[PDB]
Amino acid sequence: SQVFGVARIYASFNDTFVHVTDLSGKETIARVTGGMKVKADRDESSPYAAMLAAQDVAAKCKEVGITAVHVKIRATGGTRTKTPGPGGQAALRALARSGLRIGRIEDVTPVPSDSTRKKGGRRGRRL
Amino acid sequence: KFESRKIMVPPHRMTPLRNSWTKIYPPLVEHLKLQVRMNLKTKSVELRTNPKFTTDPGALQKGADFIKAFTLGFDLDDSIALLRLDDLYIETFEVKDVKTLTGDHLSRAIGRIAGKDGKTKFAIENATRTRIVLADSKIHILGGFTHIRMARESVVSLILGSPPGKVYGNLRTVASRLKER
Amino acid sequence: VLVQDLLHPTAASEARKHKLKTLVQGPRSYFLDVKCPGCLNITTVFSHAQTAVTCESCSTILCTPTGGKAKLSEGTSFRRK
Amino acid sequence: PEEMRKRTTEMRLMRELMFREERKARRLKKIKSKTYRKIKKKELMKNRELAADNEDHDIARAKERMTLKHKTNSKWAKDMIKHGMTNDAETREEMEEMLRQGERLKAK
Amino acid sequence: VVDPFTRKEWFDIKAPSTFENRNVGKTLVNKSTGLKSASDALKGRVVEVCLADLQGSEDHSFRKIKLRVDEVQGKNLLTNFHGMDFTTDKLRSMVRKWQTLIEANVTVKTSDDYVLRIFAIAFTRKQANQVKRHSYAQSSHIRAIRKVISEILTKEVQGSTLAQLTSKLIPEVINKEIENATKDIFPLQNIHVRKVKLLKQPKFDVGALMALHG
RNA sequence: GAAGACUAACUACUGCGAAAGCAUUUGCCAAGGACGUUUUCAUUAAUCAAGAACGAAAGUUAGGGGAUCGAAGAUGAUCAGAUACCGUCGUAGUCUUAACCAUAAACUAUGCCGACUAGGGAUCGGGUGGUGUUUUUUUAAUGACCCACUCGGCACCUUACGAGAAAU
RNA sequence: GUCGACGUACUUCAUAGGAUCA
Ligand SMILES: [Mg+2]
Ligand SMILES: [Mg+2]
Ligand SMILES: [Mg+2]
Ligand SMILES: [Mg+2]
Ligand SMILES: [Mg+2]
Ligand SMILES: [Mg+2]
Ligand SMILES: [Mg+2]
Ligand SMILES: [Mg+2]
Domain limits of chain B?
A: 1-84, 85-181
From residues 62-81 of D, which are strand G contacts by CB within 7 A? 81
CB contact under 8 A, A3 and E45: no
Separation between Cα atoms, residue C64 and residue C48, nearest integer Å: 10
Using an 8 Å Cβ cutoff, are D21 and D13 in contact? no
- Any contact of A with D, at least 3 CB pairs below 8 A? no
How far is CA D33 from each of CA B108, B112, B115, rounded to the nearest angstrom? 13, 15, 16
β-bridge mates for residue E123, sequence order: E101, E189
DSSP string, E168-206: HHTTTHHHHHHHHHTSSS---EEEE--EEEEEE-----H
Q: Which residues contact B87 (CB under 8 A, 6 or more apart)?
A: B144, B145
Chains B and A touch (3+ CB pairs under 8 A): yes
| Distance of alpha carbon B9 from alpha carbon B23, whole angstroms | 17
Q: Sheet containing C77-80: give its strands across.
A: C42-46, C31-35, C77-80
Is the Cβ–Cβ distance between E126 and E96 less than 8 Å? no
d(CA A8, CA B100): 30
CA A81 to chain centroid: 15
CA distances from B68 to A95, B7, C71 (A): 18, 7, 57
Buried b (16+ CB within 10 A) or exposed e, A82-117: bbbbbbbbbbbbbbbbbebebbbbbbebeeeeeeee
Chains that touch D (3 or more CB pairs under 8 A): E
Those residues of chain D whose CB sits closer than 8 Å to some CB in chain E are 4-5, 8, 11-12, 15-16, 19
- The set of residues, in sequence order, having a beta carbon less than 8 Å from that of E169 and lying 6+ positions away, is E84, E193, E196
CA distance B88 to B84: 9
Pick the closest to residue D4 from E9, E129, E184, E120 (CA basis): E129
**CA distances to A85, C78, E62, E94, E97 from B10, in Å:** 21, 57, 17, 9, 12
How many of the other CB atoms lie within 10 Å of CB of B130? 22
Residue C68: CB atoms within 10 A of its CB come to: 9
* Beta carbons of B42 and E59 less than 8 Å apart: yes
Q: Does A25 touch chain E (CB under 8 A)?
A: yes
Can you give the CATH number for the domain in which C57 is found? 2.20.25.100
- Look at A27 and E88 and tell me if their CB atoms are within 8 Å: no
Check: CB of residue B108 under 8 Å from CB of residue B160: no
Identify any residues that bridge with A72 across adjacent strands, giving them in sequence order.
A8, A106
CB distance E132–D15 less than 8 Å? yes
For β-strands A106-107 and A68-74, DSSP reports them as parallel
With a CB cutoff of 8 Å and minimum separation 6, the contacts of C3 are none
Q: How was this structure determined?
A: cryo-EM
E163 touches E147 (CB < 8 A)? no
| DSSP assignments along E86-102, one per residue | --HHHHHHH--SSS-EE
Q: Which residues of B touch A124 (CB under 8 A)?
A: 98-100, 159-160
- In 3-state terms, what secondary structure has residue D48? helix
**E strand or H helix that includes residue B153:** helix B145-159
Look up residue A22 and give its amino acid.
D
Q: What are φ and ψ of residue C52, in 5° steps?
A: -70, 110
Measured in Å, how far apart are chain B's first and last C-alpha atoms?
Answer: 41
Contact A93, B61 (CB under 8 A): yes
Give the B:E interface size as CB pairs under 8 Å.
7
Q: How far is A80 from chain B (nearest CA, A)?
A: 6
Give distance CA E23 / C1' F163 (Å): 83
List C-alpha distances in Å: E153 to B154, C33, E158, E180, E200: 52, 49, 9, 14, 18
Neighbour order of strands in the sheet with B35-39: B3-8, B44-49, B35-39
Q: Residue C73: which region, alpha, beta or left (left: phi > 0; alpha: psi -120 to 50)? A: beta
Reference B140, options B52, B80, B86, B75; nearest CA is B75
| Helices within D1-108 (DSSP H only) | 3-29, 34-51, 54-67, 75-82, 89-106
> Does the CA dihedral E104-E109-E110-E115 come out positive or negative?
positive
- Radius of gyration of chain C, Cα coordinates, nearest whole angstrom: 18
Nearest chain B CA: its distance from E98 CA (Å): 13
Q: How many domains does chain C have?
A: 1
Q: Tell me the C-alpha distance between E20 and E23, whole Å.
A: 9
In angstroms, the CA B106 to CA B108 distance is: 5
The enclosing H or E element of B47 equals: strand B44-49
Q: Cα separation of C43 and E26, whole Å?
A: 83
Cβ pairs bridging A and E (under 8 Å) = 45
> In strand F, which positions have an atom below 7 A from any protein CB?
4-14, 24-27, 35-38, 67-71, 83-85, 87, 109, 121-129, 132-135, 142-147, 149-151, 155-157, 164-168
What is the stated resolution of the deposited model, in angstroms? Answer: 3.5
**What CA dihedral angle connects E145, E147, E150 and E156, to 10 degrees?**
-90
- Distance CA(D48)–CA(B179), nearest Å, equals 41
CA C76 from centroid of its chain's CA atoms: 15
Q: Are the C-beta atoms of D70 and D102 separated by less than 8 Å? A: yes
Which domains occur in chain A, in start order? 1-127 (3.30.420.80)
For helices B104-114 and B145-159, the axis angle rounded to 10 degrees is 130
Contact A63, A95 (CB under 8 A): no
Round to whole Å and give the CA distance between B27 and B25: 6
Q: Which of A85, A19, A81 is nearest to A56 (CA)?
A: A19
The set of residues, in sequence order, having a beta carbon less than 8 Å from that of A66 and lying 6+ positions away, is A3, A4, A5, A20, A29
C15/A53 Cα distance (integer angstroms): 82
Which helix (H) or strand (E) segment is A1 a member of? none
Q: How far is the CA of E4 from the C1' of F97 (A)?
A: 58
Domain that holds residue C36: 1-81
CB contact at 8 A, A57 and A99: no
